[PDB]
Each structure stands twice: as C-alpha cells, then as structure tokens.
C-alpha cells in the first residue's frame, strides 16, 4: 500500500525476510579493520561458515512498560550452535553482528521502540539515554515498519578481540513512546531479535575436555 | 510412445500398426509450467 | 521467493535461494506417453467383453494415471488367454456383428492373443468422464467375443491425455504409511 | 553357427485380415486378357454416388400423390441408414457393412403428371433436439428450399452433414428413438389440377459422403 | 493503496470493472479448435451478438459455513435473454465462459474462497477438493482482492457441443478458510458471479413452437 | 563385458539391455603394477 518495500537477507542458509522494510542503517564502519595483523602472524583463518541468524528474545514492550525500558542483549552472547563451540575452541577472533529485529503488533499502535548497537560500555546514564541517536541504530513504529536492522561492524579495541571475558558489542531498545493498544489495535508486541555474526576469522586454539 | 525399442520398421507398414491422426485446417501444460521465477520481491541481502 | 498469492500464477521457488545449486533430473520415467505402455490385466467378465477403459481396476498404474486426466486418445494392444476364436468387432458395430468368421476371427493357437488394435471412435476424442456408471456408448473400442475369455489385458498406445484431474493415495494415519518393501 | 530366433509366443496365429500373403506352389500362370473390358469399378461409394436409386414407400410404390387437404406432408421419417425407404436402396444396400460414416446425401425429385398438373412441393430438414413439423409454415424455419413443376423435371437436393461427432452410427436402437441425427420431412405446398401426380424421389452419395469401419454381420 | 491495479473487461455491451484486481488466469487453453469442422459442414455462423455479461447468485459464504461448502454453478444454465433464446433455436454451438466472480466484504476479514472452472464431470470426492489447483482457476482473499476473474477456452468432447441435455462446464467455489468477521470487518459475504458466452458459432435448426 | 559375440545391435536398443551409465561433472590397480623395476641396487658382472 505505498511505494512498496521489501527485502530479504541471506547469511549462511539462514535468510530473514520482511514487507514493512523501511531499509538499514550501517554506523560507524561498512568494512573492517585489515584482519591480517601482526597479533595473530599468519596463524589467522576465515570460518564463515557459522555466519548466519540465530533467535534471542528482547522485552516484551506493554502498554505500562516506562519510558526508558531498553532491553539490553550483549552481543557475543550464549551460543548453542556453530559461533559458540568456535568461541570455546578458541581465545583470539572478532566479527560483525548482522541484526535484523522485529516487533509485531500491526498497523494500529502507537509508540515506538529506539533499537540501537553500541560498543564498549558499561552501564547508561538515563540523561544519556536522550542520544542513542550517536551509535549505530534504528527506529521502530508500527504505521510504517515492523522490521528494523541494522548492520554492525567491527570495533573492538583490537583487530582480534577475545570474547570469553569480554563482549565488546550491546543491543538496547529504549521505549521511547509508550504503547497504545487502542480501539481496533493489536493487544502486545514482543519484540523480537534475529542476530547473525558476519565477516569473522580465528586465531589461537586450546586443548580439549577431556 | 511408451517401450518400442525395435530398430525395425515393426515389420507392418505404417498405416497398419496405429490409426493416421488426419489433422485439420506438454501442449499448454509445459507453457504454464516453464514460467515459474524464483526471484524476490524485495532485494536480496548480504 | 514471496509473490502474490490470490493470483495463482505459477510462482515456484528453488534451491539457490537459501544456498545450495540446483541439479538436471532426468524424469524420462514420469513421460505420461512411457508409463500407460504396459498392459492392464482388466477381468474379462465372460466372453462378450466391451473394450472400455473404466472396467480396469481405478487403482492400477495405467488404470490410475487413465483416470487423471479427462480428456485422452490412444490406440490398443490387447492379450486373451482363451478358448476358441477371438472375432473382434469395430466401433457401432452391431452387438451381434461380432461372430462371423468373416470379421477378424483369429485362430487359436498358444496360448493368448497379441494384436493391435486402432483407436476407432467416431469422436475426435474420447474421455473417462462425460458430463454428458453413465458414460456415452461410443466410447468402446471395438468389441471382442470369442467362447471362453479369461486374461483381458489393454496395452494403451500412442498415449496422449488433455487436462487433469485429482491424484490422491493410501491414506495414512502416522503422518508415515508403513509397509514392507524389498529387503536382503 | 547359425541366426539364433525368438519364437515369440502369440505372433502369427491367423486373422481374417492378416496383412501378410500366403504361399504360392503351383505359379508361372500367363491368363487371358482383361482389356478395356466395360463398365468395371473399384469403389462402392463411386457407384452409389454415380447412381442413385428410387425409395421404399408406404405401400411400396416409390412415387407420392399430392394431397388435397391441409395434410400436407408428403414424407417424414428417421434421418439416418435405418429409414425403411432407404434400406433397400442402393447407399441403403450397403452402409450395412460399415459401423459409421459422415458426409451428404442426395435426395432427386420427379413429376409425372400432365402439362396441365402445375404443381408446388417443398423439403425440410429438422435436426435432434424436437420432433418434426406438418406446417411448411412452421417448418420454413429449419434449412429448407422450395420449388414447382416446369420444363426441366428432376431436381437433386443435397442434405447437411451435421451431428456432434464427425460420425456416428448407420445401425440403431430403441435408445436412440431420438436419433441422433435428426428427422428429415417433405411437405406440400399448393397446386392445381395435380392432385394424385407422381413426385418420385431417389437417392445417392453427394460429394461430402464418406464410409469406413468395415462390419459384416448376417443380411438378407 | 500499492503498486496500484485495475481493470475493465468489455463483452458486447456489458463491462465488469473492479479495483481489487489481482489479475486472472486462463487454464487448459487461450485458443479455441478450429470450429470449422466437417460436422457442421460450412452450415455453421458468427453470433457474438449474445457475447455478453448475465448476473446468476453462488452461496452466502458465512462464518459456519464449513471447509468445503463449493456452490456448483453449471455452464451452460438458464438464460433468460439470448444465449438462451440461441440454445432453445439450434442443436449444435459452442462457446467460452469469460466469468467475472466478485465476493463483497471488506478489506478486513479472514479466509478464501477457492474458485475454478472445471469441464465434464459428475461429482467430486472430497479427498480430491484439495486439487481444484488443477483446472482453470482463482484464489480470494479481501486483504489483496474483492475481484477472482478466471476465462475459459472450449473443451467439449467435440467440436460443436448440443447443451439441450449436456453442460460440460461447472463453476465451484469451495471454503478453503473460513470466514471471520472480526472486530470490525464486514458481517458477511455473498459471493456474487458475473459471466458471459465468448467466441461462440452455430449450426444446425428446429422448427417453431408453433 | 564377459561373452558378447553377437554380430548385431543385440536386436533391442540401446538405452534397453543395460541401465545408461551417467557422468558426472584397471583403472589404478593397473597404475600400481605397471610400474615394478627389474633393475638392481648395485650394479650387474660378469
């Protein structure tokens, strides 16, 4: 019903497809600081093979739900498949969290979420919250999108970043308009995270279990 | 027109085994068939 | 591959999409014209038995396929393993003209009957189904008679059906219908 | 050695129309000679095209005397081989031996009456769906032709080919009472003086006929 | 309110419009067989003089109304104009049915009719119903429709097919998903059906009433 | 293939006595015993 946008992302065999597209938004970088650097002397490989979605969940964005919940969700995170076992079969590496999150209600709510991907940190002061509008981020509203994404790059302060004490990437969802469910609207939206790690290659490798 | 293998002319003539189909003046099944895309009604990603 | 859907164009899909390739099958078996050339064993119910098509066994592979597909035509090649002459008889032809030897009146030998039989209607086509169990007494390919009658058999030939019909099979009930196949 | 061979079970066990010849032991046979010898023929439907034949009639006789009341039909009856009037004919005498056939036939009129027997007939041709008229009038509305007695007396009407199936049937049955190829009917205009005259007509193949599906099966 | 369709089909003076387009489809064939036939032996004439729209009532498709219920419309059927008057004057024609079904809700409900236009027949198996996806034939939905549109060629089992006691063309309608109403969608559908006789020749004459 | 001596095209067509072969994109045995020198690893007298 408009000028008509739609789109589909494949990584791996995994392939995330959405109409209420609205587009992207790539911050900070779009390439990648040369992985072929001195830390990891040639002993460096591409293993783009657990380059692909995987399913975590956000809030649930209701009604009462403050303005100011903002889910947050580190990115690396717990990995029950390929991305994880490499992270505990080795110490040095660095990627590209994909992201392409969701939030379904319908056409007839109000308010809307603020997603956005930011870097090292710790913890937000709710005075700064008032600038996710600086980090690689999106906006989400029901009268015009019920998809998001947004592609981050890599930043690390490292060209090859370790992640079993350490994640340098965090995914927040500050409610910036509370929800409205209205005459006719949908009931709840919970948000939803489609994340996929891009772009990555090792270095290093320990023993076994046994 | 099924399992005729035979390298002979089947012995009896042609206007013996099968009856002549006089014309006048997959078909349609293959046309609808062979026109399927599998393209993206989008933009692929990537 | 998303599209429209309450436009019933064809809109397939395939493989590469998602990943992988796409490979050159070579379905030379599934040949509509190859697999309706092989014989259909119908029961030659006695002697004076009618050369039609719905008399098979609606289950069998050329009876099967037969009833997929409305409209047909195709010429014939019969078997009788029987007792005396087989004397065939064309299309309209009187009942009763099927008994002079004059006729095709084949001679017994040992032990069936293989002969060619054309396609003799006086239709342009013939069908399975006539809107018109109740289906029109022009759709019999000849008709044979001989004294004793007990193999009947219909190699369809030069097959070449038109428009389709529904194809449905053993209904389950394990979402996985079990049944022994060839084992060592 | 020598070839080896499949004694195929079931190929060539005699058929009364067997493609093949037999063997010849006797030959060398010079015969006599069969030149220009008159009238012969190699086609059935070339003689009964070329020479038609009168019909079969109610009491025999193959004329028909005008009627002198508001009953005018002066025929009427099953369009198909089957009419009694035909069967006997010479196209009649025969499509017996074949199941089908399609094509035209030709119906020839004739007067007989005096100079001073002026008179009018006419022919309708009514197809499968209803039963055939006895009103000219309501009959002028199938494809028809009218004509009246003159200086030239024979005339040959040709009547259409027309059912579903390019063919059908020359035999019948007391399923198709309704037959399915329709009802021809005559009438009788007007006339003068030329009531009891004789208006005989014949039959032969029109150039649109056609016969095939050879069927032998006990006539006398 | 999308990549924008619609359309107006004219037959002799009738014109069917509508905006929920969605399309069409011709099944089995687009042509027709050479209707100059020995059968007719030339005796066969042009009338598209009655090529043209007739109005005829299918079901109320109705939120009980089960997964199956079909509404058989046989064509040829009555024609009080005509198309009639022409079957009722000859033996032997044949023609095409255009048919443009339409079925008025609302762009708001839930389910689909299934519609299509299958030749000879008698009676379906409900274990086939679900292979209508074979023979000329639409799909409804009010969320991209309010309009079907299927054109059907000439089948027959001849050339020139007599109708006074034969119809090889049948037009059904089966439930495919059931009707809701809803919040505030429409209450409930009557699907109406819209044809006309194309491409149509005779041959053949009876006598009068008279 | 063992014991085919006939003079003809065995009658019945090709893609019919045996199942078609297809390609795809002694063998070595005979490349490992094609290959065992005589020679010697000193030098031959007398």
Chains 1, 5 share one sequence.
């Not at chain 2, 002319?9 to 609808?32: C, I, P, R, V």
Request: proline share 6%; net charge negative; glycine share 6%.
């Amino acid at each position: 019903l408009l000028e008509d946008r739609i789109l589909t992302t494949r990584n791996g065999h995994t392939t995330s497809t959405t109409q209420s597209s609205v587009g992207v938004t790539y911050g900070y970088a779009t390439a990648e600081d040369f992985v072929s650097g001195p830390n990891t002397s040639g002993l460096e490989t591409r293993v783009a093979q657990a380059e692909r979605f995987f399913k975590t969940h956000l809030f649930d964005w209701v009604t009462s739900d403050p303005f100011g919940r903002c889910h947050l969700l580190e990115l690396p995170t717990d990995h029950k498949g390929v991305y994880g076992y490499l992270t505990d079969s080795y110490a040095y590496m660095r990627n590209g969290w994909d992201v392409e999150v969701t939030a379904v209600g319908n056409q007839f709510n109000g308010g809307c979420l603020l997603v956005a991907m930011v870097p090292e940190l710790c913890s937000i002061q709710k005075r700064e919250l008032y600038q996710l509008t600086l980090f690689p981020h999106q906006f989400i509203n029901p009268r015009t999108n019920m998809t998001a994404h947004i592609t981050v790059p890599f930043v690390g302060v490292n060209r090859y970043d370790q992640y079993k004490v350490h994640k340098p990437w965090t995914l927040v969802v500050m409610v910036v308009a509370p929800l409205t469910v209205n005459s006719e609207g949908a009931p709840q939206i919970k948000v939803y995270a489609n994340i996929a790690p891009t772009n990555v290659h090792v270095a290093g490798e320990f023993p076994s279990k046994e | 027109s099924g399992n005729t293998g035979s390298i002979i002319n089947n012995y009896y003539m042609q206007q013996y085994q099968n009856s002549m189909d006089t014309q006048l003046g997959n078909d349609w099944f293959s046309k609808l068939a062979s026109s399927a895309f599998s393209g993206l009604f989008g933009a692929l990603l990537a | 591959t998303t599209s429209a859907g309450e436009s019933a164009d064809p809109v397939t899909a395939t493989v590469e999409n998602y990943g992988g390739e796409t490979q050159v099958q070579r379905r030379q078996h599934t040949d509509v014209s190859f697999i309706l050339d092989r014989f259909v064993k119908v029961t030659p119910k006695d002697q004076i038995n009618v050369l039609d098509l719905m008399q098979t066994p609606a289950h069998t592979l050329v009876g099967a396929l037969l009833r997929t597909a409305t409209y047909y035509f195709a010429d014939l090649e019969v078997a009788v393993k029987h007792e005396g002459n087989l004397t065939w008889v064309p299309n309209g032809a009187p009942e009763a003209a099927l008994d002079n030897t004059t006729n095709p009146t084949a001679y017994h030998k040992a032990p069936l009957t293989r002969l060619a039989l054309p396609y003799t209607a006086p239709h342009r086509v013939l069908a399975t189904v006539y809107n018109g169990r109740a289906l029109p007494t022009s759709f019999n390919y000849g008709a044979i008679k001989a004294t004793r009658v007990t193999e009947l058999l219909y190699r369809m030939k030069r097959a070449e059906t038109y428009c389709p019909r529904p194809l449905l099979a053993i209904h389950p009930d394990q979402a996985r219908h079990k049944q022994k196949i060839v084992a060592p | 050695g020598i070839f080896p061979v499949a004694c195929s079970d079931g190929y060539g066990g005699l058929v009364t129309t067997d493609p093949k010849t037999a063997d010849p032991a006797y030959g060398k046979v010079f015969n006599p000679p069969r030149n220009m010898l008159p009238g012969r023929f190699t086609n059935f439907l070339d003689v009964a095209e070329a020479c038609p034949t009168f019909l079969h009639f109610e009491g025999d006789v193959p004329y028909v005397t005008t009627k002198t009341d508001s009953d005018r039909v002066l025929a009427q009856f099953d369009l198909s081989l089957a009419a009694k009037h035909m069967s006997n004919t010479f196209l009649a005498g025969l499509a017996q031996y074949y199941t089908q056939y399609s094509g035209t036939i030709n119906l020839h009129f004739m007067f007989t009456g005096p100079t001073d027997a002026k008179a009018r007939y006419m022919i309708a041709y009514a197809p499968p769906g209803m039963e055939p008229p006895k009103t000219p009038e309501a009959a002028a509305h199938c494809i028809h032709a009218e004509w009246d007695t003159g200086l030239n007396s024979k005339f040959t009407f040709s009547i259409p080919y027309l059912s579903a199936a390019d063919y059908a049937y020359t035999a019948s049955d007391t399923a198709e009472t309704t037959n399915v190829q329709g009802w021809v009917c005559l009438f009788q205009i007007t006339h003068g003086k030329a009531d009891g005259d004789a208006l005989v007509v014949l039959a032969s193949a029109g150039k649109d006929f056609e016969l095939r599906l050879p069927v032998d099966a006990r006539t006398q």
